[PDB]
Each structure stands twice: as C-alpha cells, then as structure tokens.
Amino acid sequence: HSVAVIGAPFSQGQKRKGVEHGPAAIREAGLMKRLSSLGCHLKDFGDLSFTPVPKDDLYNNLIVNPRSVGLANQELAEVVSRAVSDGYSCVTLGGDHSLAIGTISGHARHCPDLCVVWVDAHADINTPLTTSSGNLHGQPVSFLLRELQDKVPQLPGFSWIKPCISSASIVYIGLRDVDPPEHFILKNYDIQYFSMRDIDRLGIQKVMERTFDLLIGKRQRPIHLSFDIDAFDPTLAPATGTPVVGGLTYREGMYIAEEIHNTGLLSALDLVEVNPQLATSEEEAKTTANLAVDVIASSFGQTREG
C-alpha cells in the first residue's frame, strides 16, 4: 500500500522547547528507508513550515497560543486531507499532540466514518474550560468529540474546526495519568478506554480484541492511530515532555501496532511528542527516535518474525 509522510515541527501546543525537532530525529533514525524496506510506496511531503501568529496571548488568561495552534492545525489539516484524498495512508510526525486536531480534522474530511485509537499515557481530553495548564496539547480530543462541543469554549483561531467523531468512535490505550475533570468526561460520555491497570488485568492481547470490537465490530472503517510516544515507559522513551512511569512495554507497543496493521484498515497515523532536547544523553535521544520508527514500521507491516 502507499504511505505519505508529513513532518509537523510544531511546538506551541505546550511550553517545552524541542518537540519541533521530533520530525528530524525520527527521520534521522531511518524512518524513510525503513518504510520502503517493507515495500511501501512513499510520498514525502517534507516538513511543513507553519505561519507563526505574533502577539497570540492567553485567552481568558490561561489558554496558551490559541490562534497559533489553530492556524498550524488548519494548515496541517489541508495537507493531510490532500494525501488521504490521493489514497495515501497519512503518517504525521509531530511536535506536540495538539497536531491531532489538524490531522484528525483533515482525515475526517474524506473519511467521515473513521474511528480513532489513542495510545497515550494521558487522555488529552481537557477542554479550555477544565485545563489547569492552558497547554493545548492536553486538549486535542475536546475539539473533536461531538457530545462535548457544548462544554468546549470556542478559542480564537478555532473557528474552522468542526466536531466530527462521536464519543463511541474513539478508544484509549495506556492511560495512567488522568486529571479528575478528564475522568468525569470519560465516564459521563461513556468513552471507552484501557488504562495500564486494565492492561495489567486483561493483557494487551485481550485489550486489542475489545478495542476492535468496539470500533470495527459491526463494520469495516478507516482507522486513525494517534500514538503518543509517552505511552511507552520512560525507560524506553526518555526523550519526551511528560514522562510517566508504569508505561507500555516495548513488546506491548509493538503488539498494538502489529495488531492494527493486521486489520488492514489503517488510514492515518500520528507519532508525537518526541523531544530530542529533553534527553539526558545522545543515546537516550536516539533510543526514543528508534522506538518511534519501530512503532510506525510495525504499524505498516514490520514483523518480529520476518
């Protein structure tokens, strides 16, 4: 199958400097030639350059870089819909997870019935209303779920975003650090998730059976994999903004990816939050980058059996 690669060097969804280098790190870890090695037909859109927004201040005094994030995502959305439109499976390399706003919005533009698999240590479902930090990379899901739009203040530059997917079309895997408001939202709207605790009881295998039952149980449909590198234990992925011990194992991470590929329904994938600068050493940075590449490669066919 054909794969498209887009580098999104964005970092204004949070305050740590360095996530804008994520794309370069992953690329330098051999992502590209690793993909043809599988046999994929490649289309590299290069690394996007987003238009900054001068004097983009706090909305209501906490939401950070609203219109800067809204514009970058609007641009990314057009490139992603373009690739998905030409039949490509879109691979977006992040910066921060706020980019999921644009990639899922651009993807949904052509595959309205898409479902989402969110692999992350966090739920990123805070709204401008419940956030404590004001950092938009922890609010992506808010602006995408239809049942939430009534409790999601509209931010400057977010005009264009239009809530698409239903709360039943997204499943979380790996949650291990959820804020109380986020927990209220997940329970209230019955959003399905499998925390590390659920994985400790059911096992990654049983977890994937179910998430696919929820999403594609009654019918085939486009799958969107938004993979946050911090979903892996910090010992496996040091180079990241918000590490949280007790994460996914290298095998589990690879198992999730392998299982998604076996569905044959992957239409778009996000690999985000890889921050080279936050690594203690050169090796730590390289370890994370390689881990990122493995997840992507494995999502497109790479096997542990050959």
The catalytically annotated residue of 75, 120, 177, 259 is 120
Residue reference for tokens 């994030």: 69
Rounded to the nearest whole angstrom, what is the least distance from the CB of residue 230 to Mn ion in the complex? 4
* Residue 1 annotated in active site: no
Answer yes or no: 147 catalytic: no
Pattern of binders to Cl ion over 8-47, x per CB under 5 A? ----------------------x--x--------------
Structure-derived torsion over alpha carbons of residues 157, 163, 167, 170, reported in degrees to the nearest 10: -70
Residue 233 binds ligand S2C (CB under 6 A): no
CA pair distance 142, 149, nearest whole angstrom = 7
C-alpha–C-alpha distance, residues 197 and 181, integer Å: 19
Structure tokens at 99: 């980019």
122 is catalytic: yes
Q: How far apart are CA 217 and CA 21, in angstroms?
A: 38
Q: Which stretch binds a second copy (CB under 8 A): 111-119, 132-140, 200-208, 269-277?
A: 200-208
8 Å CB contact between 9 and 275: no
Q: Which of 21, 107, 122, 261 does the annotation list as catalytic?
A: 122
Question: Helix or strand or coil: residue 181?
Answer: helix
Should residue 218 be labelled a site residue for Cl ion when binding is judged by CB under 5 A? no
Of 47 and 179, which has the nearer Cβ to ligand S2C? Answer: 179
Considering only CA atoms, give the Rg of the chain. 17
Contact flags string 121-150 toward ligand S2C, x per CB under 6 A: -x-x-x----xxx-x-xx------------
Q: How far is the CB of 248 from Mn ion (least distance, A)?
A: 11
Q: Which two tokens stand for residue 51?
A: 């238009």
96 is in an annotated binding site: no
Residue 119: name its binding partner from Mn ion, ligand S2C, a second copy, none (Cβ under 5 to 8 Å by kind): none
Residue carrying the six token digits 């950070």: 64
Which residues carry out catalysis? Answer: 97, 120, 122, 124, 137, 228, 230, 273
